[PDB]
Amino acid sequence: SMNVILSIDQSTQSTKVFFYDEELNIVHSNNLNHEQKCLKPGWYEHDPIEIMTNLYNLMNEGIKVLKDKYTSVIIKCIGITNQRETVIIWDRITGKPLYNAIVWLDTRVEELVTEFSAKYNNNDIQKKTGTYFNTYFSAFKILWLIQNNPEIKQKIDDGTAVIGNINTWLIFNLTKGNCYTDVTNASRTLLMDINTLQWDEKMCKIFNITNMSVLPEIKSNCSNFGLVKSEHVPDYLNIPITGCIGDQQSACIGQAIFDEGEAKCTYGTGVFLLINTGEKVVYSTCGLITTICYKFNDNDKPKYALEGSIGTAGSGVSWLLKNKLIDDPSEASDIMEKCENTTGVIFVPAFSGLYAPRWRSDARASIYGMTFNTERSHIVRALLEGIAFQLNEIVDSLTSDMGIEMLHVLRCDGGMTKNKPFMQFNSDIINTKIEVSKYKEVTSLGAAVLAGLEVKIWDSLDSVKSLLRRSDAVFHSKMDDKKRKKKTSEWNKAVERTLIQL
């Protein structure tokens, strides 16, 4: 008889389910991809019903498998984590989406952001929310929906719509109607006051959200999110949803970066570096976003973070695969062993613009330096190198904002962290010691932690921390400052070529 924690990670490219035992070993896991719809230049959508169907199927297969291995199974609780910013507006009473999800990676609102940015003081927006206007957060997507679909406008006005991130969507469906979010996801909307942790009336007005009742209640990360009641997942009847957090913040909890100054970097569909700033709100002057790291309980002061976001990483590799430049993602290590340099090819991976720290939504993905000798392999390597170069820019902003000369370690996680030549190149270019987590799925691990803590599986966070801090690999820089400066100059000139106004 087996107690387990279900951790759902509804990620950008796929939905993942993880069943953890109470020693935080994975006893079953699986995933299903869902369509990445890119209809037009800059558009990026998901089908919200496809996501739910995939979720239900994965939950049902998982309990079946477990009930096959074990004598009885007890699901103690459910934690939810998710791709952030992605937004769905749906009908409250029926649950019917009024439009597809518009994903974080969508950039159709470039024109709107240019328009609004000229009308508002960017420092005032940043003080309120933690960010300048951008194409990335939910708010301009919501605005676009309201401007382009009068049904949406009408139903926000009359309070018959719900505006939600993916976490809100999942909980609403599982619970048959609860409307909740958590402070980490709310901080990704451009609608929350970053200091007070409440929906901000002024921001709502800017974005034409005329009836704030359509917004879900903002909860702490460990909370009573409700009981599963969906008839699609009958074995899960009355199992409580007890933790909820945005994916990249989830990875902070899974990496145990709980002390001020500790930093992690997750390599996934995008790459996301967060540093814990303790209870102090730190506002960047270098292109980083101020966000909520976590707030476990209602009476806790939140821990804050500075975040550097990169949009093209795994999403780039996926693009390469679709367009036949790579036969399979698994090859990327072998490609980097065999292909020792790119023969000066540079790939500025800007398919959805540049995010942190330059924030140029007018950037597009660009390849430079090719000759007849250039092969697929070199193009693939150059895209991977471009991840590292972008991360280096982020690290430079972070050290400036933090008033430090270096990070002592960067804790890293993700599939790509198993690719030794890639991680070595990252360590070389960012000039930072990198410690790779033992767990790669640290996102799902953080959600299982929060859910378990909420139902007292363990007494305290302190009983799980030594477990969490485990590492299996370390990288140090092996690259000369001469060589590094030369490579970073090459990158910098290719970014200039990509950005110059002509």
Place this chain on the structure above:
Amino acid sequence: MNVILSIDQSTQSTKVFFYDEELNIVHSNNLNHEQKCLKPGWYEHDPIEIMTNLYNLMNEGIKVLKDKYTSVIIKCIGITNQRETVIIWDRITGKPLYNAIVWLDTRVEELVTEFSAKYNNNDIQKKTGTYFNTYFSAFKILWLIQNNPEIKQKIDDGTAVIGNINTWLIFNLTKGNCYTDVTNASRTLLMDINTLQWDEKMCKIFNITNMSVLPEIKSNCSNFGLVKSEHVPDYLNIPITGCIGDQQSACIGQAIFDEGEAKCTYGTGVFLLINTGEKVVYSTCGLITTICYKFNDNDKPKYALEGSIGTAGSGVSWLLKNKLIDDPSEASDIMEKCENTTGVIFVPAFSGLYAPRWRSDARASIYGMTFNTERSHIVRALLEGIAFQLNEIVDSLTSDMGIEMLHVLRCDGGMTKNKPFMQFNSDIINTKIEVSKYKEVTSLGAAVLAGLEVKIWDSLDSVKSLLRRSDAVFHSKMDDKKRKKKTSEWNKAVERTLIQL
């Protein structure tokens, strides 16, 4: 069955055509050879592979004809070839001292920069018809001299032969004749464009200390020798009677004989030539002054201005190698199905930019991609890039010729069958395009030269009617505002590619 053998030793393959005396193709076949691109900038061919392929093609074709006809007589052989590509070999043994270094090779970029600084570039243009560049033979010869002491020593002692592909073919087929023709000699950077002789000052600049290693320059219709190679026994004592570089051959095959007439061939590269009559025209807009043809020794040559584009078919081949297209065949459907490029621009500068900008520092670059971009958009961008480059050349040509517009551009090549591609071309270059009826006008040109030399026909005037036949005309369907926009978008991309940072 009396036939003319026309050999087209092209960049990517070797083709043989047997023509009857009415210029009908009775048999043809081809074989590819390796495009060796070992390092960035490097582009080589195996000279022995080319010869082996040609002998197999010749032997198979005469087997086919003698299976089909009761008696076969090969009246004569014409040779045409990829230009600029150079091979240095031992005179006695015929052994190559190094691979062919192809016209597309750009390893000499640093030397060209050095020499362009040291010498007066207008003087080089006045002498030879071109500025220093990575394209013509001479820098490649100089690189071999500087990097291979055996080549240096065999030039100095007069035991090597320095030859373009025509010279190489004729040397092997004849067991030793060392000949070139006027058109190929003009592609070396070593010939005086006015006197049509090897220039001692040029040879000095390129460290060619002994001019005896260079072949005799002949007219295009000439006695190039009799076939003697034991590898092609059935061809024993058949005369080789025409020889011309490929792009010039396409001039003959398109009947571009009058002053101001122009053609454009689409192949591995794209090459526009305009006949300037007996006048030598020096460009101020990046075009090269070349010889169009000189049939007999007595004739004043006909000159041309030429705009050369490196990445065309060579670009398609790269796309194919890198899995961005599954077969070349698909370009048309790609362009039908793909009505625009998602705003993507591909500056196809794998070996730098050739005419009219002549920037050896340029590299192939792709701009404007989003997650919506697909292979097909990138393919179509490369193809659009051909047309944008052609437009720049047409602009240079109308300036140099002192005209407002070309009346018509006669086009040939496999790409010219692709209606959406040709229509894009005609839109962007804003020039009427007339497509030749004949698909291998390069080989036709050599067949005409070879057969004229052995007097198969009364005159060139008898064959001209057949040569002029066209089957399609394109005119621009694009409005000036949309043309100006697109050309502005290309120009900004090129500027991004070229800005010195």
